[model samples]
Target chain A: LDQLRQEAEQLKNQIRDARKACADATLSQITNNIDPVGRIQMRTRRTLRGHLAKIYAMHWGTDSRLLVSASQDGKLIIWDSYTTNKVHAIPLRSSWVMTCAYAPSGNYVACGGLDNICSIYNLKTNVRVSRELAGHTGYLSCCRFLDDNQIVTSSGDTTCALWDIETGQQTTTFTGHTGDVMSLSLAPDTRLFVSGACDASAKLWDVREGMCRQTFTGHESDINAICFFPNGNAFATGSDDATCRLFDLRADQELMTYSHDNIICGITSVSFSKSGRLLLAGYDDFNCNVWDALKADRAGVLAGHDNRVSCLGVTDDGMAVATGSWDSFLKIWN
Target chain B: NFAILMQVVPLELARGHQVALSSISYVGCSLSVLCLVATLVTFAVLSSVSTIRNQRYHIHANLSFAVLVAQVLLLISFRLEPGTTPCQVMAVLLHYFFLSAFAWMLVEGLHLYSMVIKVFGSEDSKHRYYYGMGWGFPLLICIISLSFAMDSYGTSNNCWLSLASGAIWAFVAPALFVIVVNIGILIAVTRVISQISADNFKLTAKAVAVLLPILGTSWVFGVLAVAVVFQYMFATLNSLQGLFIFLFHCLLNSEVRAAFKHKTKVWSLT
Candidate 1:
């Protein structure tokens, strides 16, 4: 009995040693893989500040250099993604201008705030664009240009509706998800788009038919974010569940799940690589992980957010990743 | 070892349906007291000995102390009752002790969930924060619950308050907050499981092993205690409730035993 007890104790010690070895190895691998970590570290985002107080959102424009961020402090800060400083800070009377997106030509910026209203800003004239896109009963969370004449806005009222820029008239409303539709993205090639909702689901909708064509559900928490792959074959979704998932249009399968531990809130945004093999997931965790889509392997992870990374955009030149986090800082990283 | 421990106790009396009322009852009582003392000493040692104080130990200690405190409370109530039925005041107050015990356990579980996941990272520097959150929040909640008990006190059968205490804090307060916070913690834990240590299977097993024993035992004792207390209230009270409450109280002694059993040569610099 004594011999058996001693042997058992030895085996337990061996197991503990193995566990410690494995943990140390994995930690080293993560640290080593991010070697000279500074090389992959890009520009810091200035828009994100505190988890509680800051209002921040980001959008990538048709041109790589044109980036726009709307702050709850009621200022729309445009970034010359190449420039280190804030290029333009358009102030509005409302205290909560949540999100602002630019037109395809980078000539006009679409913005919305807490007062349940949307306003257009022309970049060339550097002033608020005349037409106010209306019909949302709830405060508008997001507004982006669908094309030159059409604008898309998502609201707390639980709907995403299209509006005509020329007439200021409601065009069509896409209703499927059961919660507030916080954001929407149109495929660059096709008018078919995706809308993410607090209902914990993101759906692909055909605008021509005004119906959801494909619905992807796996986020056991609220859908905090979603974005299209540049190749149009797939898209990614994130949630308060602390996970990010990829939905492939060709396979109709949730290809991956990237788990995180935070609520992942804020002006959360996502982007894909030009080759379609990489996906960048940025969260309120103040870091964005560059992942290889096919292998689901993390190629690089860049951290600079003093709070959380709110939004991420890839440059048109394919040189850098633009990030916004709760530090109220926007950084262009190359 | 487990078999030996069972042998040291009178397990046959339990299985044979034979009642050696005094001897078996004493066996049960002694075993529980030992465990309670062990758990407390464990808490005390951890709080004093370790350079980096662990929050779990504090919970284990406070809960063990609460059990000891409950024992005194129950004893006083029993002496005052002149019979099995506790005086009105004793019963109402006893429920408060149990409420605080379970509430603190639930809070400790939440802290464990956070630590196991290491959510906030090294920079989060959550050592002191977690210590305060683990015990302090529950302490605040329990004080409020005790006040509610006092306010709800009534005078029938020498009871301080017949039911204002149970109605507000027992069935309502805990079921509201404990469930909400623990469920939230579970959701957060589930989400971050991937980012935790790579020894996923082992760590998960460790997590369940470490938490399940205390939590499971607490829940069992808790459910049995409430049922027994309620049964006694409605004249359906079984001696089992009393036996189980004593046993549950004794279970806290394990903290003390564990402290002595697990002393290690592993020491850190002051």
Candidate 2:
């Protein structure tokens, strides 16, 4: 009798475990059935409030697990999404932290602002400011890492600089933008990078030669944002003309323009989706507008911010977009 | 040659108006600490009866206590400047406690939603998990954030997470997640409550209005340069969060107030 009771108890435990497993499997299937490209509502999943002043820029780490934002509050914050909490807050000597970039290796972060200098901090080294690339006579508007060892910065001084990280030296200054060099984008596998300026023109440069390779002229106002295509043969720029236009570097010709009649605010930022099939642009009107890259057709709008969406960053997995606003909030749309 | 290009930049100080704004914040936060402590004591001592010790009140009392701890920590943080070891430690503690309060808020909404929807197991059986979520989740966030980037904490004079390195999102993503879920809970509970009566409708509406804004929707006030007009609205209400909780959960709550009266009468007779 005792042996028979023990066997029944063991059988009951097996049935319970199997039932739980089946329930978990069904839950997984339901979760996986959710569409990724459908007309999903872009709910404000998170509204980050910490900065005492306007937020200016956001960058995703190469790992995509980390996000960094700069603000006029003179602070740079690093956020880890896995735990959904802020991990680091690096203080800047200047009040305007306009732009920041994570190194490809994810070992360091580079930032610049109205301080007329570019500062690099080593993440592994107790967060020390490892290098200060000081040369711009005007505000340093943006910065990008060319490689793990090299970086480039744009400034209102009408110049863009190429600096060597190892020696903390400016290799050369690409001086041609007649007005503030407002934005820049680097090619994925080449010595070429593009810069858009308040001069109302976008110029392509060969970093190896430190000279202008091509200049795109068509926008009627200052070019605020620029990004390169996956093929490296073309690039896109969003300008104060309330338009986003594509330019082919090899052909030296305008490819297409993406504009909406209802758009009244200037285009402040631009980004290319990982597949290079979509172009995302941030506007002064609190919208991150998406467009078909090949045809320049309106795709969708990610809208919820209460102020101008000054900065936009897409995650590495192409699953979400993070927007930082002048309204002192950051919203991630997935 | 590289040395010639390197220049030491001086740190900037908060301007006159910023100083004035921070002063107001300091005063408001100090007052909140006092109010929260009183509420904590009242709930801890007066509500010992089994009827009043339901999971809902348990979560409420804990949320109140956590927010009280966060308020005190934030006030203490305001006195210290950024960059020191002590200041950095304080920032981490502040982040954990504030997040703990938010986690408890999310759990409170979850409990309410579960109760309304009738999807829960025994209320007693769930308290163990609720306690873990309210306390352990925030600790997990603190550990992950610190492990990933310890330097991102308290780099500002506010003695809070810095705006760079994306570290603030550690606090933000979860808080926002909770707010989103709480809104869903509010909607679900509202639908159920509305079916009851007009009096209950009024009660539910008031509770939702007070708690929803406090959780984070209050940020709508942060939208415009007309913001100075709303800044006082945002700051005053946000700083007096504990007072709001005390009013809604303890003082205004009929059962708790009755309990308060009973406990006092017992003490007087003894």
Candidate 3:
């Protein structure tokens, strides 16, 4: 049995190596595999200031002008991100916010908290007692809208739940993470979703039947953040492992490491540019590092905040990368 | 996953269900509550001079009472605190009483048929059945709807029947039934009343009274709230139902207004 397992592992590596060889050969002759990240300048274009406490997480709307962000004490602010104007301010009944999301419609937004529940705020309806989703036994760490009425959330309870707020029915619960799940991201296509966990691994699932298609293990410590590439066939993750690694869903292997010796600070958040040529990630080092995704080389470092950069996300058009800081400010880097 | 396909749709329809109508709804509901309150007491306090009389007045009072409570609840719910527990409770009562109001509407037609046309018995004849139907059946439907689909209430909608789901049909089906059948019954009542009861003078006013008291007219607007134009009409007509009822049932009749003069000791000496 041991020999059989060892043989299986050998063939897997051999198959992966052979696939990489075929990819290199194809790339050598391909006409349009042009790299564009080298010319990019990572500079701050906009500074958004309003929050009185640490910025936790943010999500940009498809229009890119509308955004939802969480700050201290579970305060969620809807922003006209272009004008840097506050659209609405919502407060959680709980004290700490873990993550936040904006829906496809301007209708609703949501946030998670340490109080073991996710809360949704409707924009038009001032219904007070309708939509507070709580099934996880542990703190809700991540959440996003599946559409207008459904929500997908991950919790420190090592599980994910898909909730149908259309009727308050829990569509299903998903379980695979061995430790507290810290982060989750939905694919642009919505067919696939991924989660990073304290178990030092990230996994992808279709979320249809709680089926885990692939389990990606690399980090030496907890994986704190995961984000999908625009194309949905690839994604990137950040960790206390002090490195960011890109992974390809189609290739079934790690793409490359986005790393440098400038500082070994723990990575907190990761995001991809629209073209997938650029990658931006937040760090405990109080800086946002921009990477040439295909080359694994640094483009520039965003340095404006006085404290840790806890979270960041790029707009749908890749025109701006919004970074949220522990310094209680947000910046738009492009 | 395969079937949860299109699991995410744009907000166009979903939010369309949630937004709007509060301002108009409030105006309509507030007036409705006041009008129903007055009509209820007018029916209660001035029984002898009422043209509709005790048994008929009792049925209308019950219908008016159901409408009054539903309108009051709707008014308060606009300013209700956010949460699930209270919302669920509001939805329960709103469902029970919304059905109650429509059930009593059916009772209005039944009583007309029972006494005006059928004339099978005297006072209190089968009134217990009317009571059971007006109160008990709505209770039955309100409870049975929980098993059929309870998520159709609360913030699924603003403490009323949520659109695009089957649970709303529990309320929709019964109210629709009353609206259709009641219209037929009232038309028959109008033709027969014109045929024998009224010897031909001022028949149009009698026809209007027969139409007004049916309760089905206001409910048609309620059911057709689907159209933008009808919503405003629904809001206007539904809210002023008590006013209409009061005008036609009490103030329109000299007997009803004369009782008010009789009850007033201030004008007695003059």
Candidate 4:
């Protein structure tokens, strides 16, 4: 028995030596790449301007070099994000707009606010009002593009609706939420979507059926934002509860929560990196944060905004992240 | 407790402002009754529309109803002749609901503490106890007070427990106790939330509205009957409880206003 045990130990040592030769001179090295969790070096790359009041929401176009933003100054400015040049500054009908979105095809943009209507704008046209998708009885809280023709919007009306932009009519309305649906995100697969609400619950829904596939709870206050994992099997939520939580579809439960003991301010927005290695979140404390998604360890604190950081998103090509603030500035970080 | 009424109970016996003060109280109570109805109707409207989950609102409704019943009973005391059997029964029920209102106010304090400061406290375990203290505790006081000293009630021309026999202290003792305990709750809650907050006017209005019910802090006026100024201030402030409740919970609360407004549209549009 002693001889056989010695033989097993000899085989293990040979395997370790072979791996060490394949990787480096180190014997116990297991990682394939340097971990970016604690070592992220992010700095503000550009501060996009031309806003006279706070910019509330922003989205990157498909090219990853251009974007559009909504502001309390009542303008939606399409920009060449690389050169910080204003491409087209379209005046909005409502200044109280809470959310904005870029169409997947890049030909149109959408925004909605206290007017209880979502406006679909054609990029080629200078027309102040393009298409009015008007069915919601309360102010629109969030809007997202499903495809070029289809869009979904959440409202203070306590229901979410899908609209056919070409026909300009409601296709479906989801009514399960008991409070205002505050935020929503479309799945990468485009077949599923999730919404967070003032009711303190986030829900997973089938895009075509309008059925709530699962209900995720545990946040103690209103959930302000939702972002889907790249794999589409999990999602993250930011809440007035002063925490962000990751919920798994297969596990059908909350898997992890992200917060620091000293950070007591409410989270206002959340986004996952394209690689899913880092989570970027904005807070009412006027700072943006980076977290290790898997370990739930805070990785970075980006503090530049003079007021609350209200919204944030990653560029489609995964090259940069942009944060919008109530201080009337949008800063790109790399 | 006796310290306050030492001044107030004597004023009640020695005042000629019976018509002057009583008229204002009557008007204020009537206004409060109307306001309480609007609040109840609003809650009822929301409850029916959502088929919702509202543990907070449920507790709020209980407090509203308790105060509503007590005020209605108070108004009836003015109409019914003193020393009658019906008057006696109304007085006992009035005492119970007033006790229940303060008890429910303490429950409000407990619930607020649970929401803000009590980290990881069990929900149903403590919830079971809140039911006991909010209503059950008041029942105990009601039973004991009546069982031992039935004659001490209904002897006052003022239609409350008689100060001559010291039975008013049965109500005063627990009421004052709740006030003191709730002061600690307010301070603790304010400390916890002071880290992040505000809506300024609405928030200050809300805190003042909130402070009113749990402590009836205006009873400081009972100790200050020397001034007709405090009397008028007390009368107006005390009777407008339901108005301010409706203001804070309905008009000033954006979510409640949105939900309420949305429901009306849903009903009318359908």
DockQ of each: 0.01, 0.01, 0.00, 0.01
Worst 10 residues of 1 chain B by lDDT: B1-10
What tens digits encode model 4's per-residue C-alpha lDDT throughout A1-334? Answer: 9999888999856655553455432211322355547657677789887787888888887788988899888888887778989888878767788899998788888998998888988876464556888657898988999998899999997899888966778888898987889999998898889898988998888987977978888889999988988888888999987899877775566667888886799898899999887889998877777888866778777776656888899987999999988877887998
Q: Which docking band does candidate 4 fall into? A: incorrect
Model 3 spans with C-alpha error above 4 angstroms: A1-36, A126-130, B1-270
Tell me how far the alpha carbon of residue B249 in candidate 4 is from the true structure, in angstroms, after superposition: 44
What fraction of the native alpha-carbon contacts across the interface, defined at 8 angstroms, is recovered by model 1?
0.00
Better of 1 and 2 by lDDT: 2
Q: Rank the candidates by lDDT, best first.
A: 4, 2, 3, 1
Who is ahead in TM-score, 1 or 3? 3
For candidate 3, lDDT tens digit of each residue in B114-140? 666777674555777888988999988
Local accuracy of candidate 2 as per-residue lDDT tens digits, A1-334: 9999888899857655554454422322433444344333445566666776788888887687788889888888888755668878889877777899988788789888878777898887547788887567888888888888899899888988889877777888788889889898888775888899988889888988877967787898999888887778888889999988877654465667778898868898788888776788898876677877766567667765546788887777777778888877787776
Put down candidate 1 lDDT per residue, A267-334, tens digits, no spaces.
Answer: 26677767666677776545577766554555566654445676677766676677776556666665
The regions of model 2 sitting more than 4 angstroms off are A1-41, B1-270
Cα deviation of A272, candidate 4, in Å: 0.7
The digit string of per-residue lDDT tens for model 3 on A158-256 reads: 998789887775788888889989989999887778899999889888867777888787788898898988788887889897899888776666767
Give residue A199's lDDT in candidate 4 (0 to 100).
88
Kindly list the per-residue Cα lDDT of model 4 for residues B58-105, writing each as its tens digit.
667778888888778788877888888888878888789888988888
**Model 2 TM-score (2 dp):** 0.50
